[PDB]
Structure formats: C-alpha cells, structure tokens
C-alpha cells in the first residue's frame, strides 16, 4: 500500500518510522483543460507530482498537432499556509505557496473515518491511528469546475481546517494566485445522534468555524 502525506508547507513531509519513501513532490489537486477539471485523489500517489510547473501537461487533437502552454489552461495545487498575496506571484515567488508531498510504501492499507461530530471518530478494532483532522469534502474555483475527495481516502482527512487550502496557477502565464471564487467544502458536525431532518442555517466567522466541522482520523490496519 502507498501512504501519501501532504505537508501543506514548502518542506517535504517525513514518512512514518517503518516506511520507505518512494519519492517526494508537489501536491497536485487538479488540472483544468478546456475548462474541464480532472482531479487526483489526495490520498493516492497520483496527487504527488515529482516536478512542478504552472502547466505540467499538453494536449493533442486528431490532426496530429499538439499544443503545450499555447492556449488558456491551468493547474491547481494544494497550498501552504503562506499568507494570501495581494497580486499573482510569478516563477520563483511561487515556491513558498505550493504544498509538498511524500509517497511512502506502507505495510497495510490506510483509511479515513469521519464522525460528523465534534468528537474524534475511533479507529476500527485492530487498526492504529496515523493522524486526526477535519473532513475535507470538495472544492470549486474557476467557473463551476473543481472536484472532491473520497471520504474513505486519507485525502479527505486534512490535519487542520483551512478556508482556502489550494491555489490557482494560470498555466502559460507562469503565475499563481488566490481568487475570490475559491470554495472549500467540509462535512459538518451534527448534534443529533444520527438523524437531522431540518438544518438551521448559519454564517460562521473565524474562531467559530471548527466546532461546526466534522472530525476524522486516518488509520492503518494493525
């Protein structure tokens, strides 16, 4: 099994004590080609690309012509906690904003469990805890494009809630930036034991958010 860890810092994360690292890279969320998003599961090795670029892909048509950084495509990456920039950052200035990752060869499968409660969900019997966090569900940015995580995948359990955990890189421009239409979606905490048929609308400001976000824990068998 392959355990994927995203540091959410400009430093590569360490692999668990008893695990060999296959490679390190940059946290890829999704590509957008022809305004169609194609995502990588944050819990799968595909979300950890060894080499970064504002435009890491090219495209071809049946006429046997391929175009690289010759149109208007873009890429999205999991970001670090660096503060929001006033203007787009270019080239070398992008580095501090891209989350780093490591792919580790593990002994057994890893899963994520979610409580939909303020309490941390316990790992199944015969399973050990790797880390705890918040239930990251989906995201949207340019247009209605975006994507989401598999709740059983470790990628759906980010160590801490973050309003805008990803950044947009505008392909051929060679710049990345945080735009106002960026949304992150998270599972909520539900007071009821198991059934809530009538949600009570609410707007949450900094400091009063986390108590409303579902908790999770990533576990590995044994």
């Amino acid at each position: 099994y392959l355990l994927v860890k995203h540091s959410q810092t400009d430093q590569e994360p360490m692999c668990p004590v008893g695990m060999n690292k296959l490679w390190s890279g940059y946290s890829l969320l999704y590509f957008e080609g022809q305004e169609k998003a194609h995502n990588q599961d944050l819990g799968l090795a595909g979300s950890c690309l060894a080499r970064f670029s504002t435009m890491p892909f090219l495209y071809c048509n049946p006429g046997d012509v391929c175009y690289y950084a010759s149109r208007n495509d873009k890429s999205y990456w999991l970001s670090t906690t660096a503060p929001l920039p006033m203007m787009p950052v270019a080239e070398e200035d992008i580095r501090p904003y891209i989350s780093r990752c490591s792919v580790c060869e593990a002994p057994a499968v890893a899963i994520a469990v979610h409580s939909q409660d303020v309490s941390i969900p316990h790992c199944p019997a015969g399973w050990r805890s790797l880390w705890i966090g918040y239930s990251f569900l989906m995201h949207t940015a340019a247009g209605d494009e975006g994507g989401g995580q598999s709740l059983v995948s470790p990628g759906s359990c980010l160590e801490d809630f973050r309003a805008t955990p990803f950044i947009e890189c505008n392909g051929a421009r060679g710049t990345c930036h945080y735009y106002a239409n960026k949304y992150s979606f998270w599972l909520t905490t539900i007071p009821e034991q198991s059934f809530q048929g009538t949600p009570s609308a609410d707007t949450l400001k900094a400091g009063l958010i986390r108590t409303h976000i579902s908790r999770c824990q990533v576990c590995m068998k044994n």
């Binding site: 929001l84 499968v109 899963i111 469990v113 979610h114 409580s115 939909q116 409660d117 969900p121 199944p124 569900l137 989906m138 949207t140 209605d144 494009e145 975006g146 994507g147 989401g148 598999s150 709740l151 059983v152 995948s153 759906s156 309003a163 805008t164 945080y178 735009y179 106002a180 960026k182 949304y183 992150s184 979606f185 998270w186 599972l187 909520t188 539900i190 009821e192 034991q193 198991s194 059934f195 809530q196 048929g197 009538t198 949600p199 009570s200 609308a201 609410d202 707007t203 949450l204 400001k205 900094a206 958010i209 409303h212 976000i213």
Partner: protein
C-alpha cells in the same frame, strides 16, 4: 480491505459472509455544492455516513467565512421502497427518515470486485473467487441541473441488489426532499453478442418489463 453494502430499505444491511461489521449508516449517493456534483462510490465507505442530514456539509470562502445551509445546495441518498406521497409535495423533517436507505461498512479478508454480464444471465465469478451477492448493473445518474455522478464498474457499488427505476431521492439545504421528474438512473443494457456491431434497436420499456432488460452483475471476493 473494506466492503460496503446498501440495503435500499430502512433496515440495516448485514455484512456479507466472511466479513466483519465496522459501522452502519445512511446511503449517500452524492452531493452538489455551488452547482458541482461530487459522488462517493457506492462500493466505498464514503457512501456510508453515520449521520443523515439534508445538508451534511458547509462551504467556506476566501475571507475565511463559512456558510451553512444558507444557499441552494443539494444532497442525494439511495432511497427505500417507500411510496412517494400522493400530493407529490416535498417531504420534510422526520418524515424523511422512511425514504433513506441504510448501509453497512465491513472489513473483508480479501479484495472484492464486481463483474457484469451485459445479459439477463448472472456473470460467473472468476476462478478462485466467491460470490457475495448478485444484482443489476448501475452505471450513473443525473438530477438537478442535469448534474450527477456514477459508479466504477469494477466496484461493488455498480451492483445494486434491488433494481429501482428511481433508486435515489433529492434533498435540499432547506430540509426538503423529493423525487423529481428529471431524476434519471443509468444502467448497463443487455446485448446479444450477435448484435454487438449492429445498430442498436431503440426500445421504450414500461413497468414489469424493466428488470428483464438490465444487465446483471455479481460481487465476488478473492477467497476460498
């Protein structure tokens, strides 16, 4: 290894033989936030939530402000045989409970997969594998705004044990749920090998003539 099962009724499904239960919950098909659909493969634990809510998520913006059940987002869940009210009006509150399917997430000793015959016959499990259950080939679906998601054909999620023309129900952050005329379920069709490369013959089927025209499937585990 995990295996997820959906009863498609208000009763908790039982873990298939050879597997142990982890937890039971409600069958989540997919959600729709800011007009974008995002599903959880029915063959994975993500399709099984411990708690139900017409709005099981919230969203947050660039100004670090989150909004919960304040806009027009959706949640979709596998439903039960519960009849649609005669009024055809939205269902609310506790009255929603009878319409939501239950699920079980179980730990299995080996990998599990689904196979499809694309005929009225049940596809055999590969040599060395054992049957967990049989059903109908469920491929994808669409609802509000023609948005939707689908199942991986190799996953048990693409093999529903009970065929339903309307297998899921639509809910809103408002706390209302209902079956709408644009709710479409897509299934693999039956194909005669003699006609694989012939123009498909169009067909419109009605009640009682449905199941016999949907591909069959079997969920198998690599053990014994």
């Amino acid at each position: 290894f995990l295996v997820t099962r959906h009863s498609q009724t208000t009763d908790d499904p039982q873990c298939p033989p050879g597997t142990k239960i982890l937890y039971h919950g409600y069958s989540l098909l997919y959600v729709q936030g800011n007009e974008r659909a995002h599903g959880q493969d029915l063959g994975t634990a993500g399709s099984c939530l411990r708690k139900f809510s017409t709005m099981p998520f919230l969203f947050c913006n660039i100004n670090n402000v989150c909004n919960f059940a304040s806009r027009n987002d959706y949640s979709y869940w596998l439903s039960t045989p519960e009849p649609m009210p005669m009024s055809m009006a939205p269902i609310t509150g506790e009255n929603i409970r009878p319409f939501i399917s239950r699920c079980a997430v179980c730990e299995a000793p080996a990998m599990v997969m689904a196979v499809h015959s694309q005929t009225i016959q049940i596809p055999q499990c590969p040599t060395g594998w054992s049957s967990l259950w049989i059903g109908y080939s469920f491929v994808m679906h669409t609802s509000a705004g023609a948005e939707g998601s689908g199942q991986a054909l190799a996953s048990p999620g693409s093999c529903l044990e009970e065929f339903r023309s309307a297998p899921f129900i639509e809910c809103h952050g408002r706390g209302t749920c209902n079956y709408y005329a644009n709710a479409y379920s897509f299934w693999l069709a039956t194909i005669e090998r003699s006609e694989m490369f012939k123009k498909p013959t169009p067909s419109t089927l009605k009640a009682g003539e449905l199941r016999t025209h949907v591909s069959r499937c079997q969920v198998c585990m690599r053990r014994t």
